[PDB]
Amino acid sequence: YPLDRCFDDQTKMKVCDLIADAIGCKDKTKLDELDEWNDMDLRGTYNKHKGVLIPPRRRQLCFSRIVRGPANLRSLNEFKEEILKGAQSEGKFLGNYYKEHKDKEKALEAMKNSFYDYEDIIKGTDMLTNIEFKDIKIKLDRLLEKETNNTKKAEDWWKTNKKSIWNAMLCGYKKSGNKIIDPSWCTIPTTETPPQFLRWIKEWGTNVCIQKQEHKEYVKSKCSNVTNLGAQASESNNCTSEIKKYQEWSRKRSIQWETISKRYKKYKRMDILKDVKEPDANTYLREHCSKCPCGFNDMEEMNNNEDNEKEAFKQIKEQVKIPAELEDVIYRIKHHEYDKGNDYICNKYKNIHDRMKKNNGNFVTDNFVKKSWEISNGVLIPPRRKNLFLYIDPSKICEYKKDPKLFKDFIYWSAFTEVERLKKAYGGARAKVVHAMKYSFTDIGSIIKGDDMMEKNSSDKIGKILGDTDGQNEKRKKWWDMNKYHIWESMLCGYREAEGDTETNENCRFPDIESVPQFLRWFQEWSENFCDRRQKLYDKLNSECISAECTNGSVDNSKCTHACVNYKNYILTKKTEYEIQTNKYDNEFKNKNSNDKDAPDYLKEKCNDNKCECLNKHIDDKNKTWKNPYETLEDTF
């Protein structure tokens, strides 16, 4: 009762106690956030804009000004503050559900949205046919203004005329008899007033994003941990269809926010800020509230496109894997890429890049493209990865690691700079650059998890950070994903610089090779860097002499003589490596995840470019090996 109790209590503030409730409020709380805000707010909605979604606006504008009489009972009107009487409390008056939901932030957000809605109405920004919205607002303002002065109507009237604003939420129900001692909760950022454009777009953003947060809540709570052995106990399959229903109504909102992209049509009244930059609505929502993303984009996948989709007939059916796909985190935009590059988030992401880190330590151009293979442990790590640009030093240590966000940004910067490094290394070669991004991304993943054979020093450094002080890398693993999406889109954005707008449809949108073991990835890339080198060799000097393998040691001309020399040295190196990777595989990566196949079969099936899957001339690379040319390399228990 008399406790600390934000100043409302300890004020001798019996004034609000003497203040009663408005004659309005025919409801204090009806059904909250759900499918009601669609178009049922106005008729002839085309006026002044297209018909749009609304907050709990028509659901709470308690109407004590029934008469709309003269400004004689309306000197300070005693209702535009009285209607708000009732607040964060035992749990009613616009937020009733939070007491059952056990979250004060729900009531606080309801208060803030309704409050700024009243600010809008006082200034006048509504697109809905409401009597108070009509002249009565400015009529009362002008009538109160009738003293041959004060033509600052909105600025002076904005609460009444005297006390700044917002004094009406305090002393709610039971004088707001349920609270939290922190004044930051007890008073909102009243001082800052987002503009009316920002207010209506934030109306939209909240009214959709908070609902989609609760939609994620339905997705996680029910329709998941079910239909997977099992529930409840009949089948619980139809729960899946329920999200299909959610999507449906949400998808309407989809096209609706497209109008929000236009909003006049005039794409924006104002520009880049904490929640708004609006190249599109999805960018706003990503830039939007702390208790965001979008969403949860823009799923389940109808559109939200260009491709990819699932998505037909509908579904296949064969059953839909949205259960398996989305029951687990993913909780956010992965769906992506699609974007494909038609965006703004990339360039502002570059605005993040080379800033907060000004290339204060940056290496490129070692020309590892034209180099050979090296053991470095007796293990033959790729020259692709040998100088992979990422390394930390003192001032980036366990004591330094109290800024995981900044460290994450540094990792993104490293990946982006790596993208430019590959650009310079190939001198620009888009097809090669895409696979460059593939192995670089997946090897950065290996490092950040920490399994690399050649890495022995910065692996310990990243072990110092991110915890995991034992041999286990659990926290590093649970970091790597989910950071996979952000790192990969970072590298894709880096790649887009030369293309501008050209989707890497040739590649898997997210590199699937992330799943497979790291050593297998190195073998795959060295196979990819193999027998494309061979084709270049045939182009160089086998083109003129002659057509194929010569029928002796080698001679038709001195040039392709040297071509055969390079060939046999290259094959010698390949046989040594192929041997070491084969024994490594059959020993310690064979038949885990039940890969019943020899390493060359893995080479065949994982390859898709068809440059690999060699199949050499004077064949040494194939699905098998000579000396009993059947296959090998099987293991079991």
Residue numbers in the entry: 1988 to 2624
Per the authors:
Parasite-infected red blood cells sequester in the placenta through interaction between parasite-expressed protein VAR2CSA and the glycosaminoglycan chondroitin sulfate A (CS) abundantly present in the intervillous space. Here, we report cryo-EM structures of the VAR2CSA ectodomain at up to 3.1 Å resolution revealing an overall V-shaped architecture and a complex domain organization. Compared to other PfEMP1s, the ~310 kDa VAR2CSA ectodomain is relatively conserved among parasites. It is composed of a short N-terminal segment and six Duffy Binding-Like (DBL) domains (DBL1-DBL6) unique to VAR2CSA. Several of the DBL domains are linked by complex inter-domain (ID1-3) regions with limited or no homology among PfEMP1s yielding a DBL1-ID1-DBL2-ID2-DBL3-DBL4-ID3-DBL5-ID4-DBL6 structure.
The DBL5 and DBL6 form a rod-like structure with weak inter-domain contacts. Flexibility of these domains is further supported by two separately generated maps based on different subsets of particles, showing the same core structure, but different conformations of DBL5/DBL6. By contrast, DBL1 and DBL5/6 were less well resolved compared to the apo structure.
